[PDB]
Amino acid sequence: KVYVELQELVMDEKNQELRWMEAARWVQLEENLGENGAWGRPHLSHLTFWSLLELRRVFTKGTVLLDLQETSLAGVANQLLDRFIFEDQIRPQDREELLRALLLKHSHAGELEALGGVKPAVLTRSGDPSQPLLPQHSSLETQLFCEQLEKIPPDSEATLVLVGRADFLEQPVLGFVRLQEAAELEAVELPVPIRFLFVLLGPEAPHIDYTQLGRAAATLMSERVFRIDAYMAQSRGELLHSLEGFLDCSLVLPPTDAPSEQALLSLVPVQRELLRRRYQSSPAKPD
Amino acid sequence: QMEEPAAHDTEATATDYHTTSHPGTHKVYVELQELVMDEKNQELRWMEAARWVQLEENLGENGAWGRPHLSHLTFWSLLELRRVFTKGTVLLDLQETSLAGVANQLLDRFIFEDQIRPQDREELLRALLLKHSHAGELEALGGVKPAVLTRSHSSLETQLFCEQILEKIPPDSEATLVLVGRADFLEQPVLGFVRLQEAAELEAVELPVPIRFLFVLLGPEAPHIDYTQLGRAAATLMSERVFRIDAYMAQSRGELLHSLEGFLDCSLVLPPTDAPSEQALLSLVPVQRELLRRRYQ
């Protein structure tokens, strides 16, 4: 298995300084970081329909830097922004601010209580952190699992998911990076080398919650089939095909006013068949 | 005559057709019908495929209804359903008591919105007015194979629930009919949503309860477009209480799309997980409970 960490750009409460704070982590089973400063009970990842829809939209036009010869967040960010501009995904004027935001201090649970917590933030055209304008929604995962690391194998490689909001952006942008050699970055404190980097930047838009987008990306990375495809992928098309299979094998549960265990357990054959379909194509077999 | 006026999108008079009567609260029975061909005569017809009363039942290759199950939906189903509904044609409070009149009005509206060409109207009308068979006749019809409409693998639910009504339908229940067909001559998929002014017992389609809603989903073979699953998604949407209320009180396509967006907001996606099936499915119970804690308040 592998370690996936999701970090969201947020503003501290003591000095109003924006920074990156880990919001969730995955070792197969997902943990979330509550406002208290402790990790909630780990759980199977569940995604919202809008998050997966927007993830597919951004990935279809995303930026991929495979077998990239870099070993530092600074160089990775430089190359990623350069290819973003080359792909007309961000304008040259945005590069300075986006780079400034990316190489900010990445804080973790060890400084949440030391600091004054973290509030959501939106990067501004200037060097100041804006306040989100769209209505906020307290994370469902934090409400349901949090209000109350040895599992990483020695030879596993980690993945970093960065989500941030920037009002000075035309549309959401996805940047996917696979380093040629796994490297240790200051963003992740754990002594696990990083192989993949998800970068999800963009403005405030309806039906897009960048936390849910990051959760969807992290769940996709945590999936064995998609991870194997990503390791062996030499083009964006193969990653897109793996994502299409991942969505083909997903099960959408519509809202119901009369939930029950028996009705829900009637979907056991469906879930089994979907997992079988997902693992039929990948080299891996289902555990 | 010489003029062929282009449809003008105008709503200055839309409120003049908004009724002041509060629609009644009715339980919904949904029947999904697909355009098929019978081996006995090669004659195109509409055939029962699935029904919703309390849960979803599917009709297998044998004439026997499958095990009732919760209505799972594919991601592509909801994506495409939202896409078609965004451009869909809606006839609300339609004063029609026969299938022929409903079909003619819906096709006229399709032409007005330029969803179909004038040359597609006759073939679509022929398709919509074919005989509407039911599961009982499937055995006497010499079987049934899937079919496509022209200008001139088994479904997962069947595989997982079918290989092996009046009592359960409440008294004040009104039916929703979902019509799903493939027309290779259409350029784009088209969605038709009809709410009759009053519930009607359409003779062409005899259901256990009078029909109040009609879903028409037609189009060609397109990427990620599975029309049976699209009909399943529409039926599940109709079976949901909040969207059913919104559809009863909806006066414009925008309100229906807002209700659909809320439905998608309160929808949970279980990705492919390697955990035991019982644990994977039961892990959604608290999550769904928290997700729906406000939808039904």
UniProtKB/Swiss-Prot annotation, chain A:
Residues 1-287 are cytoplasmic. Detected in erythrocytes (at protein level). GO terms for molecular function: ankyrin binding; bicarbonate transmembrane transporter activity; chloride transmembrane transporter activity; chloride:bicarbonate antiporter activity; hemoglobin binding; monoatomic anion transmembrane transporter activity; protein homodimerization activity; protein-membrane adaptor activity. Changing A217D: In SPH4; Boston. The modification Phosphoserine is found at S130, S282. GO terms for biological process: bicarbonate transport; blood coagulation; chloride transmembrane transport; chloride transport; erythrocyte development; intracellular monoatomic ion homeostasis; monoatomic anion transport; negative regulation of glycolytic process through fructose-6-phosphate. Keywords: Acetylation, Anion exchange, Blood group antigen, Cell membrane, Disease variant, Elliptocytosis, Glycoprotein, Hereditary hemolytic anemia, Ion transport, Lipoprotein, Membrane, Palmitate, Phosphoprotein, Transmembrane, Transmembrane helix, Transport. It is found in: Cell membrane; Basolateral cell membrane. Residues 236-287 are annotated as: Dimerization arm. Changing G75R: In SPH4; Fukoka. Changing R215 to A/E/S: Impairs expression at the cell membrane. Changing P259R: In SPH4; Tuscaloosa. Belongs to the anion exchanger (TC 2.A.31) family. It is linked to Ovalocytosis, Southeast Asian: An autosomal dominant hematologic disorder characterized by ovalocytic erythrocytes that are rigid and exhibit reduced expression of many erythrocyte antigens. Clinical manifestations include mild hemolysis, intermittent jaundice and gallstones. However, the disorder is most often asymptomatic. Spherocytosis 4: An autosomal dominant form of spherocytosis, a group of hematologic disorders characterized by the presence of numerous abnormally shaped erythrocytes which are generally spheroidal. Affected individuals have anemia, jaundice, and splenomegaly. Clinical severity is variable. Some individuals are asymptomatic, whereas others have severe hemolytic anemia requiring erythrocyte transfusion. A dimer in solution, but in its membrane environment, it exists primarily as a mixture of dimers and tetramers and spans the membrane asymmetrically. Component of the ankyrin-1 complex in the erythrocyte, composed of ANK1, RHCE, RHAG, SLC4A1, EPB42, GYPA, GYPB and AQP1. Interacts with STOM; this interaction positively regulates SLC4A1 activity. Interacts with GYPA; a GYPA monomer is bound at each end of the SLC4A1 dimer forming a heterotetramer. Three SLC4A1 dimers (Band 3-I, Band 3-II and Band 3-III) participates in the ankyrin-1 complex. (Microbial infection) Interacts (via N-terminus) with P.falciparum (isolate K1) aldolase FBPA; the interaction inhibits FBPA catalytic activity. It comes from Homo sapiens (Human).
Swiss-Prot record, chain B:
Residues 26-239 are annotated as: Globular. Detected in erythrocytes (at protein level). The chain holds residues 30 to 348 of 911 of the full protein. GO terms for biological process: bicarbonate transport; blood coagulation; chloride transmembrane transport; chloride transport; erythrocyte development; intracellular monoatomic ion homeostasis; monoatomic anion transport; negative regulation of glycolytic process through fructose-6-phosphate. It is linked to Ovalocytosis, Southeast Asian: An autosomal dominant hematologic disorder characterized by ovalocytic erythrocytes that are rigid and exhibit reduced expression of many erythrocyte antigens. Clinical manifestations include mild hemolysis, intermittent jaundice and gallstones. However, the disorder is most often asymptomatic. Spherocytosis 4: An autosomal dominant form of spherocytosis, a group of hematologic disorders characterized by the presence of numerous abnormally shaped erythrocytes which are generally spheroidal. Affected individuals have anemia, jaundice, and splenomegaly. Clinical severity is variable. Some individuals are asymptomatic, whereas others have severe hemolytic anemia requiring erythrocyte transfusion. Belongs to the anion exchanger (TC 2.A.31) family. Disulfide bonds: none annotated. GO terms for molecular function: ankyrin binding; bicarbonate transmembrane transporter activity; chloride transmembrane transporter activity; chloride:bicarbonate antiporter activity; hemoglobin binding; monoatomic anion transmembrane transporter activity; protein homodimerization activity; protein-membrane adaptor activity. Residues 147-152 are annotated as: Interaction with ANK1. It comes from Homo sapiens (Human). This is Band 3 anion transport protein. GO terms for cellular component: ankyrin-1 complex; basolateral plasma membrane; blood microparticle; cortical cytoskeleton; cytoplasmic side of plasma membrane; extracellular exosome; membrane; plasma membrane. N-glycosylated. Changing P276R: In SPH4; Tuscaloosa. Functions both as a transporter that mediates electroneutral anion exchange across the cell membrane and as a structural protein. Component of the ankyrin-1 complex of the erythrocyte membrane; required for normal flexibility and stability of the erythrocyte membrane and for normal erythrocyte shape via the interactions of its cytoplasmic domain with cytoskeletal proteins, glycolytic enzymes, and hemoglobin. Functions as a transporter that mediates the 1:1 exchange of inorganic anions across the erythrocyte membrane. (Microbial infection) Acts as a receptor for P.falciparum (isolate 3D7) MSP9 and thus, facilitates merozoite invasion of erythrocytes. Acts as a receptor for P.falciparum (isolate 3D7) MSP1 and thus, facilitates merozoite invasion of erythrocytes. It is found in: Cell membrane; Basolateral cell membrane. The modification Phosphotyrosine is found at Y17. Residues 253-297 are annotated as: Dimerization arm. Residues 1-297 are cytoplasmic.
